[PDB]
């Protein structure tokens, strides 16, 4: 029973590989020979936000490019005003450990998750004038690794029990479930139209999910180790992944394979966060060796380096209008590069 | 209007600063312990459990890892800021001791856990006494081993059981002395199935860890 299914699976995998090799007419690094270089991008630190006590783990820019939410391990969740460097809200969390935080597109809700397996959604309206738990979701059995707001009432979550979930905040129930991975699922990224999304797990595969249907469409296995970072290209038809193998890879949703690989011989450190720029020409990758490399996303060359941090870069965020880039690391500082 | 907002946000900033200057004071004072142990082992003596207590007007938070997944390589990197990792193993089916050896090896060699100290408890010392009449099979090096001249045995203990104790200890010590001695240390202890001195032990080692950390700052150790 198992032999006729395993051999069939091997045949189907070989068919997919041969289809990919059949469609491989050329590479991105051949048709981009006559492209002007991006020069030396020398970015400057404009601000330095200093409020957190423990290491900063995750951050997320708001849709207005004004406010940002930062989550530390000390149990505090701080909302920063990027212009005036004023702390707007400080929220004490019930648990100490936080792994994810998300800022709603409308700015009404802030969600946070960690090892506690409970996703706390905070309402920022507060006509009383104090933050309060709107509703807490407890339907996971591992640890909550990443969450993102589709809109005010829907939130996608990623857990460490090999499954992803979609919640309804008003009811507090799971709308559906996503069961395709065979390892811990690290992070996910939503398309601008909120129609499709990708999920990167610790089995070196990336799954393309249909939000409305509840099934996966594509599986991309181009990596050698666990995929930590994943970020959609601004048009929603490509995405770049950052694994522990120290190489970045750029995948496509229509070519159904990798387009380009980013590697340097003097870099043997793991990748913790990636993010495209507004236009998509620059790709910012925060590495384990205490700096952020600015990769040319169409030439595979280093535009520059952001060596401002004194400890492991944990999170990297780019504004929706591309005006600034904020990076958070384990030295408890937020560096905003111009 | 433009002035009122730029005064209100200054006052909001100052109030949040005052709150963080009382919470920074609390956070730096309290020490943190990670209670990592096997399921077989007696770890009793949502996802995560928490114990909050105090000894000699010093606060201790101890964190019990509950219903997690067996893949530790991701979530353990959140624990590189605790003051000590307490590691409890039950002496004895498979070779659970070999799994404990491999886990301790992985903890020790880990890059992000080089600045964290490990407190070590050897549990089920009574079961070892019960095993003297029924071990040697899974270890070919127990025969070529002598009992320490510098470790005193408590009264009423079969010397073979003390030999097994010190052998197991030295199996953990060879791992701990294999690399990275300078940065962090390993503190092995003994414990019964029912014992009460354990908390005093942990206290008298946590002080030692903090003292050695300050002496590392002044480049003395």
């Amino acid at each position: 029973e198992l032999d006729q299914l395993r051999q069939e699976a091997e045949q189907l995998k070989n068919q997919i590989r041969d289809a990919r090799k059949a469609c491989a007419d050329a590479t991105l690094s051949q048709i981009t020979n006559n492209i002007d270089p991006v020069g030396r991008i020398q970015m400057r630190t404009r601000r330095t936000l200093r409020g957190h006590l423990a290491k900063i783990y995750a951050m997320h820019w708001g849709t207005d490019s004004r406010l940002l939410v930062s989550a530390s391990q000390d149990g505090k969740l701080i909302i920063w005003d990027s212009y005036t460097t004023n702390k707007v809200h400080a929220i004490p969390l019930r648990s100490s450990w936080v792994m994810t935080c998300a800022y709603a597109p409308s700015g009404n809700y802030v969600a946070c998750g960690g090892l506690d397996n409970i996703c706390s959604i905070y309402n920022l309206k507060t006509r009383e004038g104090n933050v309060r738990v709107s509703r807490e979701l407890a339907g996971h059995t591992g640890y909550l690794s990443c969450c993102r707001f589709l809109d005010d009432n829907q939130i996608v979550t990623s857990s460490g029990d090999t499954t992803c979930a979609l919640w309804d905040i008003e009811t507090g129930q799971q709308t559906t479930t996503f069961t395709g991975h065979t390892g811990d699922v690290m992070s996910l990224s939503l398309a601008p139209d909120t129609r499709l999304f990708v999920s990167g797990a610790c089995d070196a595969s990336a799954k393309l999910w249909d939000v409305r249907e509840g099934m996966c469409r594509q599986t991309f296995t181009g990596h050698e180790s666990d995929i930590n970072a994943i970020c959609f290209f601004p048009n929603g038809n490509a995405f770049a992944t950052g694994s522990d193998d120290a190489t970045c890879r750029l995948f496509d949703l229509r070519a159904d394979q990798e387009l380009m690989t980013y590697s340097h011989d003097n870099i043997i450190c793991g990748i913790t966060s990636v993010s495209f720029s507004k236009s998509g020409r620059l790709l910012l990758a925060g590495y384990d060796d205490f700096n952020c490399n600015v990769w040319d996303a169409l030439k595979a060359d280093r535009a520059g380096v952001l060596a401002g941090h004194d400890n492991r870069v944990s999170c990297l965020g780019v504004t929706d209008d591309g005006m600034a880039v904020a990076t958070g690391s384990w030295d408890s500082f937020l560096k905003i590069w111009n | 209007d433009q002035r009122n907002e730029e005064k209100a946000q200054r006052e909001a900033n100052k109030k949040i600063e005052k709150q963080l200057q009382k919470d920074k004071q609390v956070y730096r004072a309290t020490h943190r312990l990670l209670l990592l142990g096997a399921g077989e082992s007696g770890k009793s003596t949502t996802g995560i459990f928490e114990t909050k207590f105090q000894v000699d007007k010093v606060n201790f938070h101890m964190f019990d890892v509950g219903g997690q997944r067996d893949e530790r390589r991701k979530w353990i990197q959140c624990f590189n800021d605790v003051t000590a990792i307490i590691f409890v193993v039950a002496s004895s089916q498979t070779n659970r001791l070999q799994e404990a050896l491999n886990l301790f090896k992985s903890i020790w060699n880990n890059r992000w856990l080089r600045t964290i100290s490990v407190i070590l408890f050897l549990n089920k010392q009574d079961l070892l006494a019960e095993k003297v009449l029924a071990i040697e099979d899974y270890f070919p090096e127990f025969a070529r081993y002598t009992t320490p001249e510098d470790a005193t045995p408590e009264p009423g203990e079969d010397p073979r059981v003390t030999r097994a104790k010190y052998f197991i200890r030295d199996e953990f010590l060879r791992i701990s002395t294999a690399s990275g001695d300078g940065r962090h240390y390993c503190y092995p202890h003994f414990t019964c199935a029912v014992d009460t001195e354990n908390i005093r032990r942990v206290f008298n080692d946590c002080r030692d860890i903090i003292q050695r950390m300050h002496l590392r700052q002044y480049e003395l150790l």
Partner: nanobody
Amino acid sequence: QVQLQESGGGLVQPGGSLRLSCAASGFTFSNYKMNWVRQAPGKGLEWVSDISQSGASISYTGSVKGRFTISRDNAKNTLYLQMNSLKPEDTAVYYCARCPAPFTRDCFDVTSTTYAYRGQGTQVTV
């Protein structure tokens, strides 16, 4: 795509000798520390032996220490295990396992809950 293909095995008599191979395809074999894990019938996964990237540092489980010989071939990308002085108690399913991260010393590959970086396994019976 990281894929591992165990080779060799079969029914052998106690006191015999047998060799295994592990075809490592789809990754940079030279930069990964690897090891052998086994599953005894009705028991959990137990560590057998390992080998570092360069091949200098080698260690074995006590019960099989000095009886097995692990060797990696970075030229052809294959892991080679020699087993002499076989015992009736050494029957198990063998897994060629890879450590998840490059250029490191620590590994976490004893997870029975569908650990992705190990081969399908081979049967050894005595």
